[PDB]
mmCIF file of all heavy atoms in Angstrom:
data_model
loop_
_atom_site.group_PDB
_atom_site.id
_atom_site.type_symbol
_atom_site.label_atom_id
_atom_site.label_comp_id
_atom_site.label_asym_id
_atom_site.label_seq_id
_atom_site.Cartn_x
_atom_site.Cartn_y
_atom_site.Cartn_z
ATOM 1 N N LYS A 1 13.885 -197.823 -79.576
ATOM 2 C CA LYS A 1 12.659 -197.493 -80.341
ATOM 3 C C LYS A 1 12.732 -196.030 -80.765
ATOM 4 O O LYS A 1 12.466 -195.745 -81.940
ATOM 5 C CB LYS A 1 11.434 -197.708 -79.454
ATOM 6 C CG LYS A 1 10.139 -198.018 -80.189
ATOM 7 C CD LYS A 1 9.021 -198.396 -79.245
ATOM 8 C CE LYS A 1 9.440 -199.434 -78.225
ATOM 9 N NZ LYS A 1 9.864 -200.701 -78.865
ATOM 10 N N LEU A 2 13.120 -195.149 -79.845
ATOM 11 C CA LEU A 2 13.190 -193.700 -80.149
ATOM 12 C C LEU A 2 14.268 -193.440 -81.208
ATOM 13 O O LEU A 2 14.015 -192.630 -82.110
ATOM 14 C CB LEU A 2 13.451 -192.929 -78.856
ATOM 15 C CG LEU A 2 12.219 -192.488 -78.067
ATOM 16 C CD1 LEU A 2 10.944 -193.089 -78.633
ATOM 17 C CD2 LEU A 2 12.371 -192.822 -76.594
ATOM 18 N N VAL A 3 15.423 -194.098 -81.112
ATOM 19 C CA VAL A 3 16.506 -193.909 -82.123
ATOM 20 C C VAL A 3 15.996 -194.401 -83.477
ATOM 21 O O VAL A 3 16.273 -193.738 -84.494
ATOM 22 C CB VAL A 3 17.824 -194.587 -81.714
ATOM 23 C CG1 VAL A 3 18.796 -194.705 -82.874
ATOM 24 C CG2 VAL A 3 18.483 -193.870 -80.548
ATOM 25 N N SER A 4 15.233 -195.493 -83.486
ATOM 26 C CA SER A 4 14.646 -195.994 -84.754
ATOM 27 C C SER A 4 13.691 -194.945 -85.315
ATOM 28 O O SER A 4 13.702 -194.733 -86.538
ATOM 29 C CB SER A 4 13.926 -197.279 -84.525
ATOM 30 O OG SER A 4 13.159 -197.635 -85.663
ATOM 31 N N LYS A 5 12.911 -194.307 -84.442
ATOM 32 C CA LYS A 5 11.919 -193.295 -84.882
ATOM 33 C C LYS A 5 12.642 -192.124 -85.544
ATOM 34 O O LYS A 5 12.118 -191.607 -86.541
ATOM 35 C CB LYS A 5 11.079 -192.819 -83.695
ATOM 36 C CG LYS A 5 9.941 -193.737 -83.283
ATOM 37 C CD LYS A 5 8.828 -193.780 -84.302
ATOM 38 C CE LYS A 5 7.605 -194.517 -83.804
ATOM 39 N NZ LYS A 5 7.938 -195.903 -83.396
ATOM 40 N N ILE A 6 13.808 -191.737 -85.032
ATOM 41 C CA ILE A 6 14.471 -190.524 -85.585
ATOM 42 C C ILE A 6 14.717 -190.776 -87.069
ATOM 43 O O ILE A 6 14.447 -189.868 -87.865
ATOM 44 C CB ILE A 6 15.784 -190.211 -84.845
ATOM 45 C CG1 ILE A 6 15.546 -189.945 -83.359
ATOM 46 C CG2 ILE A 6 16.519 -189.056 -85.504
ATOM 47 C CD1 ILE A 6 16.804 -189.608 -82.604
ATOM 48 N N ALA A 7 15.174 -191.973 -87.430
ATOM 49 C CA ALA A 7 15.509 -192.213 -88.852
ATOM 50 C C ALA A 7 14.256 -192.125 -89.730
ATOM 51 O O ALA A 7 14.344 -191.519 -90.808
ATOM 52 C CB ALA A 7 16.189 -193.545 -88.994
ATOM 53 N N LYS A 8 13.142 -192.712 -89.290
ATOM 54 C CA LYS A 8 11.905 -192.734 -90.116
ATOM 55 C C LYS A 8 11.387 -191.309 -90.320
ATOM 56 O O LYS A 8 10.989 -190.986 -91.450
ATOM 57 C CB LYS A 8 10.846 -193.626 -89.460
ATOM 58 C CG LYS A 8 9.563 -193.819 -90.258
ATOM 59 N N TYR A 9 11.415 -190.487 -89.269
ATOM 60 C CA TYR A 9 10.899 -189.098 -89.359
ATOM 61 C C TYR A 9 12.026 -188.148 -88.963
ATOM 62 O O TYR A 9 12.099 -187.758 -87.789
ATOM 63 C CB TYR A 9 9.744 -188.898 -88.379
ATOM 64 C CG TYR A 9 8.661 -189.944 -88.419
ATOM 65 C CD1 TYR A 9 8.506 -190.846 -87.381
ATOM 66 C CD2 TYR A 9 7.774 -190.015 -89.478
ATOM 67 C CE1 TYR A 9 7.508 -191.805 -87.401
ATOM 68 C CE2 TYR A 9 6.771 -190.968 -89.516
ATOM 69 C CZ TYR A 9 6.637 -191.866 -88.473
ATOM 70 O OH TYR A 9 5.650 -192.808 -88.501
ATOM 71 N N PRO A 10 12.934 -187.774 -89.883
ATOM 72 C CA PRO A 10 14.079 -186.944 -89.529
ATOM 73 C C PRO A 10 13.720 -185.532 -89.058
ATOM 74 O O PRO A 10 14.338 -185.074 -88.121
ATOM 75 C CB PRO A 10 14.831 -186.801 -90.858
ATOM 76 C CG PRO A 10 14.349 -187.960 -91.697
ATOM 77 C CD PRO A 10 12.900 -188.122 -91.301
ATOM 78 N N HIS A 11 12.737 -184.896 -89.691
ATOM 79 C CA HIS A 11 12.418 -183.472 -89.399
ATOM 80 C C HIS A 11 11.953 -183.213 -87.962
ATOM 81 O O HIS A 11 12.343 -182.171 -87.422
ATOM 82 C CB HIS A 11 11.412 -182.962 -90.429
ATOM 83 C CG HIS A 11 11.446 -183.736 -91.702
ATOM 84 N ND1 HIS A 11 10.552 -184.755 -91.970
ATOM 85 C CD2 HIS A 11 12.266 -183.660 -92.773
ATOM 86 C CE1 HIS A 11 10.814 -185.268 -93.155
ATOM 87 N NE2 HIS A 11 11.862 -184.613 -93.668
ATOM 88 N N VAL A 12 11.155 -184.096 -87.359
ATOM 89 C CA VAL A 12 10.600 -183.759 -86.013
ATOM 90 C C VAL A 12 11.763 -183.588 -85.039
ATOM 91 O O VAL A 12 12.495 -184.561 -84.831
ATOM 92 C CB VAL A 12 9.640 -184.860 -85.532
ATOM 93 C CG1 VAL A 12 9.008 -184.516 -84.195
ATOM 94 C CG2 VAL A 12 8.571 -185.164 -86.569
ATOM 95 N N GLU A 13 11.899 -182.398 -84.452
ATOM 96 C CA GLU A 13 12.989 -182.116 -83.482
ATOM 97 C C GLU A 13 12.721 -182.844 -82.173
ATOM 98 O O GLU A 13 13.689 -183.256 -81.528
ATOM 99 C CB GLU A 13 13.156 -180.616 -83.256
ATOM 100 C CG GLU A 13 14.408 -180.251 -82.482
ATOM 101 N N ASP A 14 11.456 -182.995 -81.792
ATOM 102 C CA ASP A 14 11.151 -183.566 -80.455
ATOM 103 C C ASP A 14 11.716 -184.982 -80.316
ATOM 104 O O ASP A 14 12.136 -185.334 -79.209
ATOM 105 C CB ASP A 14 9.670 -183.440 -80.107
ATOM 106 C CG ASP A 14 9.244 -182.004 -79.869
ATOM 107 O OD1 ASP A 14 9.373 -181.539 -78.719
ATOM 108 O OD2 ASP A 14 8.799 -181.360 -80.838
ATOM 109 N N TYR A 15 11.693 -185.768 -81.389
ATOM 110 C CA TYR A 15 12.236 -187.144 -81.322
ATOM 111 C C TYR A 15 13.725 -187.065 -80.975
ATOM 112 O O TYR A 15 14.185 -187.854 -80.139
ATOM 113 C CB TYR A 15 11.942 -187.900 -82.618
ATOM 114 C CG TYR A 15 10.624 -188.626 -82.633
ATOM 115 C CD1 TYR A 15 9.799 -188.587 -83.743
ATOM 116 C CD2 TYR A 15 10.209 -189.369 -81.542
ATOM 117 C CE1 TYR A 15 8.589 -189.258 -83.764
ATOM 118 C CE2 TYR A 15 9.002 -190.046 -81.546
ATOM 119 C CZ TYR A 15 8.189 -189.991 -82.662
ATOM 120 O OH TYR A 15 6.999 -190.657 -82.677
ATOM 121 N N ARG A 16 14.455 -186.119 -81.568
ATOM 122 C CA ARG A 16 15.886 -185.938 -81.211
ATOM 123 C C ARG A 16 15.974 -185.526 -79.739
ATOM 124 O O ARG A 16 16.867 -186.026 -79.039
ATOM 125 C CB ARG A 16 16.541 -184.940 -82.166
ATOM 126 C CG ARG A 16 16.194 -185.191 -83.625
ATOM 127 C CD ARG A 16 16.324 -183.951 -84.484
ATOM 128 N NE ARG A 16 17.709 -183.539 -84.656
ATOM 129 C CZ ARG A 16 18.477 -183.901 -85.677
ATOM 130 N NH1 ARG A 16 17.991 -184.681 -86.627
ATOM 131 N NH2 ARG A 16 19.726 -183.478 -85.747
ATOM 132 N N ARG A 17 15.073 -184.654 -79.284
ATOM 133 C CA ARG A 17 15.098 -184.179 -77.876
ATOM 134 C C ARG A 17 14.818 -185.332 -76.910
ATOM 135 O O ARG A 17 15.431 -185.345 -75.833
ATOM 136 C CB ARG A 17 14.142 -183.007 -77.658
ATOM 137 C CG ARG A 17 14.415 -181.812 -78.559
ATOM 138 C CD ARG A 17 13.997 -180.510 -77.909
ATOM 139 N NE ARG A 17 14.721 -180.313 -76.663
ATOM 140 C CZ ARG A 17 15.856 -179.635 -76.555
ATOM 141 N NH1 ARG A 17 16.394 -179.072 -77.623
ATOM 142 N NH2 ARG A 17 16.446 -179.516 -75.380
ATOM 143 N N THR A 18 13.903 -186.239 -77.251
ATOM 144 C CA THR A 18 13.556 -187.306 -76.278
ATOM 145 C C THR A 18 14.774 -188.194 -76.014
ATOM 146 O O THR A 18 14.960 -188.575 -74.851
ATOM 147 C CB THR A 18 12.265 -188.050 -76.633
ATOM 148 O OG1 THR A 18 11.982 -188.917 -75.535
ATOM 149 C CG2 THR A 18 12.345 -188.851 -77.910
ATOM 150 N N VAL A 19 15.561 -188.519 -77.046
ATOM 151 C CA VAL A 19 16.715 -189.444 -76.838
ATOM 152 C C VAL A 19 17.722 -188.790 -75.884
ATOM 153 O O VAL A 19 18.294 -189.515 -75.059
ATOM 154 C CB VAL A 19 17.355 -189.947 -78.144
ATOM 155 C CG1 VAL A 19 16.304 -190.438 -79.121
ATOM 156 C CG2 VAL A 19 18.264 -188.922 -78.798
ATOM 157 N N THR A 20 17.935 -187.477 -75.984
ATOM 158 C CA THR A 20 18.840 -186.801 -75.016
ATOM 159 C C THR A 20 18.258 -186.897 -73.604
ATOM 160 O O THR A 20 19.034 -187.123 -72.663
ATOM 161 C CB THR A 20 19.139 -185.356 -75.427
ATOM 162 O OG1 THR A 20 17.971 -184.569 -75.196
ATOM 163 C CG2 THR A 20 19.577 -185.231 -76.868
ATOM 164 N N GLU A 21 16.944 -186.728 -73.461
ATOM 165 C CA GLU A 21 16.300 -186.780 -72.125
ATOM 166 C C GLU A 21 16.454 -188.176 -71.515
ATOM 167 O O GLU A 21 16.720 -188.251 -70.305
ATOM 168 C CB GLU A 21 14.837 -186.352 -72.215
ATOM 169 C CG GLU A 21 14.077 -186.509 -70.912
ATOM 170 C CD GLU A 21 14.639 -185.716 -69.745
ATOM 171 O OE1 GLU A 21 14.953 -184.528 -69.938
ATOM 172 O OE2 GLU A 21 14.749 -186.290 -68.644
ATOM 173 N N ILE A 22 16.287 -189.240 -72.309
ATOM 174 C CA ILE A 22 16.365 -190.631 -71.764
ATOM 175 C C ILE A 22 17.785 -190.883 -71.249
ATOM 176 O O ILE A 22 17.913 -191.497 -70.181
ATOM 177 C CB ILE A 22 15.855 -191.712 -72.738
ATOM 178 C CG1 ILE A 22 15.424 -192.980 -71.997
ATOM 179 C CG2 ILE A 22 16.862 -192.024 -73.828
ATOM 180 C CD1 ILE A 22 14.321 -192.756 -70.997
ATOM 181 N N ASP A 23 18.809 -190.381 -71.943
ATOM 182 C CA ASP A 23 20.196 -190.536 -71.440
ATOM 183 C C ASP A 23 20.343 -189.830 -70.087
ATOM 184 O O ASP A 23 20.891 -190.445 -69.162
ATOM 185 C CB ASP A 23 21.200 -189.986 -72.447
ATOM 186 C CG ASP A 23 21.346 -190.847 -73.687
ATOM 187 O OD1 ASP A 23 20.625 -191.854 -73.783
ATOM 188 O OD2 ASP A 23 22.185 -190.505 -74.540
ATOM 189 N N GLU A 24 19.847 -188.600 -69.952
ATOM 190 C CA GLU A 24 20.043 -187.856 -68.681
ATOM 191 C C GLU A 24 19.285 -188.556 -67.550
ATOM 192 O O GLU A 24 19.835 -188.633 -66.440
ATOM 193 C CB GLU A 24 19.582 -186.408 -68.799
ATOM 194 C CG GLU A 24 20.405 -185.566 -69.749
ATOM 195 C CD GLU A 24 20.141 -184.082 -69.574
ATOM 196 O OE1 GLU A 24 19.493 -183.717 -68.573
ATOM 197 O OE2 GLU A 24 20.578 -183.295 -70.432
ATOM 198 N N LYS A 25 18.074 -189.044 -67.816
ATOM 199 C CA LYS A 25 17.261 -189.672 -66.743
ATOM 200 C C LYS A 25 17.996 -190.908 -66.232
ATOM 201 O O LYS A 25 17.992 -191.133 -65.012
ATOM 202 C CB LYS A 25 15.863 -190.045 -67.236
ATOM 203 C CG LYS A 25 14.916 -190.551 -66.157
ATOM 204 C CD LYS A 25 13.458 -190.287 -66.455
ATOM 205 C CE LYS A 25 12.955 -191.036 -67.668
ATOM 206 N NZ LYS A 25 13.013 -192.501 -67.463
ATOM 207 N N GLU A 26 18.610 -191.669 -67.138
ATOM 208 C CA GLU A 26 19.305 -192.912 -66.726
ATOM 209 C C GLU A 26 20.455 -192.552 -65.783
ATOM 210 O O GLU A 26 20.652 -193.285 -64.810
ATOM 211 C CB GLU A 26 19.766 -193.715 -67.937
ATOM 212 C CG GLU A 26 20.056 -195.168 -67.614
ATOM 213 C CD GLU A 26 18.858 -195.963 -67.124
ATOM 214 O OE1 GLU A 26 17.724 -195.620 -67.507
ATOM 215 O OE2 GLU A 26 19.063 -196.920 -66.353
ATOM 216 N N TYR A 27 21.172 -191.462 -66.049
ATOM 217 C CA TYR A 27 22.355 -191.136 -65.213
ATOM 218 C C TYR A 27 21.921 -190.902 -63.765
ATOM 219 O O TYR A 27 22.554 -191.453 -62.850
ATOM 220 C CB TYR A 27 23.073 -189.901 -65.751
ATOM 221 C CG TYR A 27 24.327 -189.532 -65.006
ATOM 222 C CD1 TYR A 27 25.550 -190.071 -65.364
ATOM 223 C CD2 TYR A 27 24.291 -188.650 -63.940
ATOM 224 C CE1 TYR A 27 26.707 -189.742 -64.682
ATOM 225 C CE2 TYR A 27 25.438 -188.312 -63.245
ATOM 226 C CZ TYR A 27 26.649 -188.861 -63.620
ATOM 227 O OH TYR A 27 27.783 -188.527 -62.947
ATOM 228 N N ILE A 28 20.845 -190.141 -63.564
ATOM 229 C CA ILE A 28 20.341 -189.881 -62.186
ATOM 230 C C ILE A 28 19.886 -191.211 -61.588
ATOM 231 O O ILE A 28 20.171 -191.456 -60.403
ATOM 232 C CB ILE A 28 19.220 -188.827 -62.196
ATOM 233 C CG1 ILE A 28 19.580 -187.636 -63.085
ATOM 234 C CG2 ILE A 28 18.875 -188.391 -60.781
ATOM 235 C CD1 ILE A 28 18.486 -186.604 -63.197
ATOM 236 N N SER A 29 19.225 -192.050 -62.388
ATOM 237 C CA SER A 29 18.714 -193.354 -61.892
ATOM 238 C C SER A 29 19.849 -194.288 -61.469
ATOM 239 O O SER A 29 19.710 -194.911 -60.414
ATOM 240 C CB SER A 29 17.845 -194.016 -62.916
ATOM 241 O OG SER A 29 17.483 -195.320 -62.493
ATOM 242 N N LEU A 30 20.927 -194.382 -62.250
ATOM 243 C CA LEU A 30 22.010 -195.347 -61.919
ATOM 244 C C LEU A 30 22.650 -194.952 -60.588
ATOM 245 O O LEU A 30 22.919 -195.850 -59.780
ATOM 246 C CB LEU A 30 23.041 -195.381 -63.047
ATOM 247 C CG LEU A 30 22.576 -196.033 -64.346
ATOM 248 C CD1 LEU A 30 23.572 -195.776 -65.463
ATOM 249 C CD2 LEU A 30 22.360 -197.525 -64.157
ATOM 250 N N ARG A 31 22.865 -193.654 -60.368
ATOM 251 C CA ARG A 31 23.462 -193.173 -59.094
ATOM 252 C C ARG A 31 22.516 -193.520 -57.944
ATOM 253 O O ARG A 31 23.006 -193.897 -56.870
ATOM 254 C CB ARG A 31 23.717 -191.668 -59.157
ATOM 255 C CG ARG A 31 24.770 -191.177 -58.175
ATOM 256 C CD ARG A 31 24.805 -189.666 -58.097
ATOM 257 N NE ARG A 31 25.896 -189.211 -57.251
ATOM 258 C CZ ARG A 31 25.815 -189.070 -55.934
ATOM 259 N NH1 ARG A 31 24.687 -189.350 -55.306
ATOM 260 N NH2 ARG A 31 26.863 -188.650 -55.250
ATOM 261 N N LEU A 32 21.208 -193.394 -58.169
ATOM 262 C CA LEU A 32 20.217 -193.751 -57.124
ATOM 263 C C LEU A 32 20.334 -195.246 -56.791
ATOM 264 O O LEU A 32 20.241 -195.582 -55.606
ATOM 265 C CB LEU A 32 18.815 -193.397 -57.617
ATOM 266 C CG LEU A 32 17.724 -193.383 -56.548
ATOM 267 C CD1 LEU A 32 18.066 -192.395 -55.444
ATOM 268 C CD2 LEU A 32 16.374 -193.049 -57.160
ATOM 269 N N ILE A 33 20.541 -196.105 -57.793
ATOM 270 C CA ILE A 33 20.690 -197.569 -57.540
ATOM 271 C C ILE A 33 21.919 -197.804 -56.663
ATOM 272 O O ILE A 33 21.785 -198.526 -55.667
ATOM 273 C CB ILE A 33 20.815 -198.362 -58.856
ATOM 274 C CG1 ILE A 33 19.593 -198.204 -59.760
ATOM 275 C CG2 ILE A 33 21.114 -199.825 -58.581
ATOM 276 C CD1 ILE A 33 19.746 -198.900 -61.090
ATOM 277 N N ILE A 34 23.059 -197.180 -56.976
ATOM 278 C CA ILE A 34 24.297 -197.474 -56.195
ATOM 279 C C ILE A 34 24.090 -197.014 -54.752
ATOM 280 O O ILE A 34 24.412 -197.773 -53.831
ATOM 281 C CB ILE A 34 25.541 -196.848 -56.847
ATOM 282 C CG1 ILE A 34 25.848 -197.506 -58.191
ATOM 283 C CG2 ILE A 34 26.737 -196.933 -55.916
ATOM 284 C CD1 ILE A 34 26.237 -198.958 -58.066
ATOM 285 N N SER A 35 23.509 -195.829 -54.574
ATOM 286 C CA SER A 35 23.267 -195.305 -53.209
ATOM 287 C C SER A 35 22.285 -196.217 -52.475
ATOM 288 O O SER A 35 22.506 -196.486 -51.288
ATOM 289 C CB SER A 35 22.782 -193.888 -53.248
ATOM 290 O OG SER A 35 21.584 -193.783 -53.997
ATOM 291 N N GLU A 36 21.239 -196.667 -53.162
ATOM 292 C CA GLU A 36 20.220 -197.536 -52.525
ATOM 293 C C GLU A 36 20.826 -198.886 -52.121
ATOM 294 O O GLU A 36 20.478 -199.364 -51.037
ATOM 295 C CB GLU A 36 18.981 -197.675 -53.407
ATOM 296 C CG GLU A 36 17.970 -196.568 -53.180
ATOM 297 C CD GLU A 36 17.394 -196.528 -51.775
ATOM 298 O OE1 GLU A 36 17.174 -197.609 -51.197
ATOM 299 O OE2 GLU A 36 17.174 -195.415 -51.260
ATOM 300 N N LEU A 37 21.695 -199.472 -52.951
ATOM 301 C CA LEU A 37 22.347 -200.756 -52.580
ATOM 302 C C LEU A 37 23.207 -200.539 -51.328
ATOM 303 O O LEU A 37 23.165 -201.402 -50.440
ATOM 304 C CB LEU A 37 23.164 -201.295 -53.755
ATOM 305 C CG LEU A 37 22.375 -201.690 -54.998
ATOM 306 C CD1 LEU A 37 23.310 -202.202 -56.079
ATOM 307 C CD2 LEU A 37 21.329 -202.737 -54.663
ATOM 308 N N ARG A 38 23.927 -199.416 -51.245
ATOM 309 C CA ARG A 38 24.760 -199.103 -50.052
ATOM 310 C C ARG A 38 23.833 -198.972 -48.844
ATOM 311 O O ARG A 38 24.184 -199.482 -47.767
ATOM 312 C CB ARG A 38 25.543 -197.811 -50.287
ATOM 313 C CG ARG A 38 26.470 -197.404 -49.153
ATOM 314 C CD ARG A 38 25.976 -196.125 -48.510
ATOM 315 N NE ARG A 38 25.868 -195.024 -49.454
ATOM 316 C CZ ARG A 38 25.376 -193.830 -49.152
ATOM 317 N NH1 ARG A 38 24.940 -193.585 -47.929
ATOM 318 N NH2 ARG A 38 25.312 -192.885 -50.072
ATOM 319 N N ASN A 39 22.672 -198.349 -49.035
ATOM 320 C CA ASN A 39 21.682 -198.197 -47.940
ATOM 321 C C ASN A 39 21.237 -199.583 -47.475
ATOM 322 O O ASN A 39 21.153 -199.803 -46.257
ATOM 323 C CB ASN A 39 20.483 -197.393 -48.443
ATOM 324 C CG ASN A 39 19.191 -197.667 -47.703
ATOM 325 O OD1 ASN A 39 18.175 -197.977 -48.319
ATOM 326 N ND2 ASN A 39 19.215 -197.547 -46.386
ATOM 327 N N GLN A 40 20.987 -200.495 -48.415
ATOM 328 C CA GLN A 40 20.474 -201.828 -48.029
ATOM 329 C C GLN A 40 21.514 -202.532 -47.164
ATOM 330 O O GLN A 40 21.118 -203.119 -46.155
ATOM 331 C CB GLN A 40 20.179 -202.669 -49.270
ATOM 332 C CG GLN A 40 19.152 -202.061 -50.212
ATOM 333 C CD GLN A 40 17.743 -202.121 -49.679
ATOM 334 O OE1 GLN A 40 17.467 -202.752 -48.661
ATOM 335 N NE2 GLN A 40 16.830 -201.470 -50.380
ATOM 336 N N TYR A 41 22.797 -202.442 -47.519
ATOM 337 C CA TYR A 41 23.804 -203.231 -46.764
ATOM 338 C C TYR A 41 23.832 -202.790 -45.302
ATOM 339 O O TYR A 41 23.771 -203.662 -44.423
ATOM 340 C CB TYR A 41 25.184 -203.100 -47.409
ATOM 341 C CG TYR A 41 25.385 -203.892 -48.676
ATOM 342 C CD1 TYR A 41 25.620 -203.262 -49.884
ATOM 343 C CD2 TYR A 41 25.374 -205.275 -48.661
ATOM 344 C CE1 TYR A 41 25.814 -203.982 -51.050
ATOM 345 C CE2 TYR A 41 25.569 -206.012 -49.816
ATOM 346 C CZ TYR A 41 25.790 -205.363 -51.015
ATOM 347 O OH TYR A 41 25.984 -206.080 -52.159
ATOM 348 N N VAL A 42 23.871 -201.482 -45.052
ATOM 349 C CA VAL A 42 23.968 -201.010 -43.639
ATOM 350 C C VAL A 42 22.674 -201.376 -42.904
ATOM 351 O O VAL A 42 22.764 -201.871 -41.765
ATOM 352 C CB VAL A 42 24.327 -199.515 -43.525
ATOM 353 C CG1 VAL A 42 23.480 -198.629 -44.423
ATOM 354 C CG2 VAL A 42 24.291 -199.024 -42.089
ATOM 355 N N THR A 43 21.519 -201.178 -43.550
ATOM 356 C CA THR A 43 20.217 -201.450 -42.886
ATOM 357 C C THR A 43 20.100 -202.942 -42.575
ATOM 358 O O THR A 43 19.714 -203.275 -41.444
ATOM 359 C CB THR A 43 19.049 -200.998 -43.765
ATOM 360 O OG1 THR A 43 19.272 -199.635 -44.126
ATOM 361 C CG2 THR A 43 17.706 -201.136 -43.082
#
C-alpha cells in the first residue's frame, strides 16, 4: 500500500521514509521469531 502511495504522490518525502522504516522493523521482527521458536523448543 505504501509503495503504491509513493507513485500517486511522488513529492511527499515521508512516504519514501515510511517504506524504509517498514523494511527495518521486519528485520528485527524476523530475528525475534527465530529466537522465540528456539525458546519454545527448550521450554
